[model samples]
Target: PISPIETVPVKLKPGMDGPKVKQWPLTEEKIKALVEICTEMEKEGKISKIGPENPYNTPVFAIKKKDSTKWRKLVDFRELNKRTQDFWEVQLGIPHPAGLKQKKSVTVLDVGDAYFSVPLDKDFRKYTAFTIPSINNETPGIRYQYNVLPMGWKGSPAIFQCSMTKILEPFRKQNPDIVIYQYMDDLYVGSDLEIGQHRTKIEELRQHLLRWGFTTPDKKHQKEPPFLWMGYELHPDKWTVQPIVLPEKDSWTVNDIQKLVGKLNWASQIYAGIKVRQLCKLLRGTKALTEVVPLTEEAELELAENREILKEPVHGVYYDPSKDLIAEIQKQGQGQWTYQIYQEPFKNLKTGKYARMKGAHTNDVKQLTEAVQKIATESIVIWGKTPKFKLPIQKETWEAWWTEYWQATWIPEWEFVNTPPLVKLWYQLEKEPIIGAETFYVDGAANRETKLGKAGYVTDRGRQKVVPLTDTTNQKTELQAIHLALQDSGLEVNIVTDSQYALGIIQAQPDKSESELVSQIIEQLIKKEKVYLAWVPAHKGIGGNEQVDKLVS
Candidate 1:
């Protein structure tokens, strides 16, 4: 538990340059938010004001609200991130903070203003300062800093996570039977023991939190045999996830399109099968095109079908075989795939959390023998398109089959290409790497209409190879080009592609993809000697990558 004083400030190596920025102009809205929300919090001891008020270099803004009269605090920590990028690193110790599906005899507690509970280092308070418009005649203008972890600072999440870990330490030690998932501000409590077994522990922890100054609201404290959270609903023995289509818009606006695209994503995921990629594709017409880009006749039909496909009773999306989507995607080839037993959360999945695989549940290998003997008892999804219940799987032989079904390699982080993408630091690290160290540029293109695709890559050897994809996707092609580079080389290699989605597929790992090719890439990695993978910001003038783009064209 942290004290009410201040935190340790960020210490950098000598001579390193920081955010070289000055004050940003403030508006009346920012002034109102600063005085109303910020000052109020400080008075409530949510934060404390520290140091010289001037020399504010960072910017702040009032987030827009639909109600118009209200605004929330939104701080831009970009500059701070740049300054601390190299040294500020934190590891996530908790895996997807979600409980076992349908094991809903649990309660969730929300710790209000969780970040404020973590003390801030007084030494670096200057870097956290921001300018606010004058409060009144006497206090003309002021730049204020925080004595506690601020909401928008770059180190907030890492720092808060570490703080919370320490806070929960004692409770975990005392109550070994209780399992808790402390996700930022929220605390989820549950256990395999009967509800009464660990119910007392939650109460004790709440009391402990109070003495530390964290107040948990009464309503937020939830419990039960039935539960619904983050677009996922719990049943007696399984979890169900569904997509919610909004009301039909008569005339659409940019905001409406954006809102719908965003809402379709999981608030937090409990189940593993919803598809954000397909939904994003439907919204693609809005990007780099008119807000009202008329849907083509083909697209109109697609929207209708896509809407229906996303509406399955339970089984749907990502897990469904390719042939089921458009039929032609399966004409050339198809491979049998079962649910991947997903555990990694390092990747940013749709829910902003890790996605879990749908099949068997325990993490230990010996427990594999204890799974339900009759696959027919519950519909076990078969080799392709649909789930087949009562398939009569042999319990003793199932473990062997499950092993082969989810074939993937877990590679060490050091072996991959190291250059991250150009997005925010959090979003850039998802690139997966290869074994060989040879450098080559690669790119791919796929015709949206014909689905015909081509991949190309060139290395220093003056050798460039182009291959035709009979029925592949745009992203699939981009990755295939990298695959082409890695497949023939025995050394580690890196690729540069403009596709952010392609980079996300490779890097935003911790949550792996079930796409057959993605699985193939990981499976392929295990056999390599020294492969490397890296992503370069595309269209920004890198000769090798730009040349590869031309080759793709």
Candidate 2:
């Protein structure tokens, strides 16, 4: 059922007249089509419908841009604004818009109450005489009134926005470098800097707004190293844009691909009349058929090659010691020198000098020299009978033995000494053998006495522990501690650390050797669904880590 009808009289100002009537009539079908569009839009949740009991259920119409023919409209519901109370007084600061490099700061000011209005359909003849009631009962047929409205009125949002723009007109004229934009009470201030000038410009903006009877929120006014505005976190340097929350993970689905294809098809609509047979051929080749088929051998090879390139180490030698070409020398059989010496005149091979030869002999002198040197230096000194069977040694053979000894025996023992206890802790944490233990908080504290470090851990329980780690003056102790905790836990463990850089290092695996160690721990833990690492803000009252910090410190 329709609500009670009311008539609103139009006020005529000095040079203003009511809207000029157009004689052209719209057909019922045309009107129905327009209504259907609105109805469907409403059903799709793109627009809202007004209720019959609503005092401001006025019809709205669209306007097209004079130059570009873009559709635009104003939603008017002015009567609601006229009855509402509690207007907001806003003070805005805007930075210089241009030549901002010369200016220090930029802020915009807005000080005014918003006004609203609603439009009625011209074709509705039954409600033509109905008049809207005024707040003041001075005139019977006068109907319309104006006053402050509630902030959330339908039309107030736009009104507040437009009013602020108008209020900043003088400032914009005086300082061309500043531009102001307002959406309700929110204001955006942008500026270019002249080295440590933001504070001055902000102060200027505050004073300007104060003169206009608007005040900024005392505590809400923020100027700090990290500032947030419009869902973006800003660094003090003003050089980066960081979202408040981490970005959603990237993935693909059949619907996603379909949507992409739909967009591409829509873009191709501009070429309507042209014979798109060539384009059609291209599209056919690009059909989703390939996505459904298994990879061919060539495609597999290409993918493998790409993976290899990506997986290849960025640094370090790739020598295969086992395949050394020097080893091939041993396969060649030893041979003796064949030249014979006689007690007669002989000519030198190259110089052609003649000389008498005495006690002439032939043997593999080169091989003999090498063998003698190898036996003397390279061979292991062992006391045995029968010349020790040539010792089977080569040049620098002792070095290779030393390397093997260190790798197999000596080095492993030394590594145990250097391998901080934290690794074991990490292993246990990863395994989660202890009940009521779900997380491990790791922190590093340096000891000046021994020039060593301590890595402390706090379990999910109030219990805590600390283990001495290798002396590294940096946060390496913390990272090593995390590895140990995960290793020892033997359960799914969540690692919390205060160091963002260390967290990134683990996440990106930038250091191959260190990354390998961390990766091994991760891989083992993941099998049990046991280990995960997260970065937590440091020193900001995170209870577990904070308690751990105090204990270790």
Candidate 3:
């Protein structure tokens, strides 16, 4: 509906074709929720059911919202996004408490369905078309294209910002004295005047936004000092930052840990004195969303400690001219130089949003002064150059440096080591099978010289096929066989494959899987619940295994 005012034009790279991706598997609950979502969007004329054909078609999947209860459908626009041009790179300036005066109170306005309010141009709607997985045999997989700008699109934020910026332009010009800082949909209105006068201004601004097809709720209008703005609590004196409250779960997924670590990293803007050593160490073990990581005692303890730290208010320091700004430069073993600059009183205080930089080595006072000036524009008092210590030139002689020196504890130690070659040994001592499940045995064979292969699968119910494949390895063909067998989305079937490489790929998510076949198999794995993939040794005289192997050969 907002298209009457302004429709977003898709600015894509010249001569580049967008991608068409199939939707991944989803749970029954998510499928039901998505149906409801589509129905509502259809009624609002936000999206229309389109014929199952589009060049820029992409997959859509549901993820739990911040509340951990509501479902939010998001399109996978990663491929399409890569092909588009980044027309808008500049975000609005964030309003910091440092910019606010002690007398100014603030009001935070959150625009509901922010991006959805801005419609997309009709020519570009084809790029936003997404697949909706079928619910039953009566219903086939369908595509629904968006009329409004949807979330997860790379251009949504910047384009929506442009729209919102235009809507607020007149109001901003009208109230030049009032400070209105807009970060996307969230607006921070600050004024030195009394709360009564501020309310009058807010009403006037609201009317202006209404005329431009934007609305802010009464509940979002905060006229108090302790205003929650962009994940931080802003007060008259200081700001408070806290980690996101994770949903209650006993087993933590790689996705969950990553979110927690990311939240903590953001919170570090306020609570920077402490480092999460164990949590960072734990994050190294897994790399995918479905991959679960077992919590070590140290990791659990550190998580608890962090929880306690967040229990109370975590405050960041205000600028103090009396504090000495210390700059320390050191050469790292990795052929890069690291420079850390901070204040003496608040040792963790950062400059220019970050305190660390890795660049060319600079040791002298003049070089250090130039580097410091690059980060902080104001003239700073650089202290005396501290004596530098030499590190061991060889790996065998490396040791930790412990000293009373200010920079000693911050030194990073490195070891030049190569990754060990992967071992390809796997043994299945006992046959384990899922009872009463539809099962299939798959196999692939390749000529060692040509590296070309054939794929095949045999079901226990006497169904089988020898499938032709494109140029691929025997391991990839093995995955192709499984992908062929799992094509029947109606059944939750078990797949047995002899290829260890294929099994390993299934265990961990294939990030941007090299081949379309591998990507398709991953989608199948996500589609069906309790669809198990078991490993079986090849040429083991198993009836179904032998049959599939012979078919492939």
Pick by TM-score: which candidate is best? 3
Query: Compared with the true structure, what per-residue lDDT tens digits does model 3 show for residues 328-423?
Result: 434333223343444543433332323333432212222323433443432221222221222222333122112211232233323232322211
Which is better, 2 or 3, measured by lDDT? 3
TM-score of each: 0.48, 0.22, 0.55
User: Candidate 2 vs candidate 3: which has greater TM-score?
Assistant: 3
Question: Model 1, range 156-200, lDDT digits (tens) per residue?
Answer: 777777777777888789877676766665676765556675567
Ranking by lDDT: 3, 1, 2
Off by over 4 Å in 2: 1-146, 179-181, 192-200, 211-213, 236-553
lDDT of each: 0.53, 0.38, 0.63
- lDDT winner among the candidates? 3
For residues 427-450, what per-residue lDDT tens digits would candidate 2 score against the true structure?
212223333447788777767676
Screening candidate 3 with a backbone cut-off below 3 angstroms (N, C-alpha, C), the clashing residue pairs are none
Runs in model 1 lying further than 4 Å from the true structure = 1-9, 12-14, 17-30, 48-54, 66-68, 85-104, 134-140, 192-199, 228-231, 242-553
TM-score attained by model 3: 0.55
Give the root-mean-square deviation of each candidate in angstroms: 17.9, 35.9, 22.9
Instruction: Give the CA lDDT, 0 to 100, for residue 19 in model 2.
Output: 26
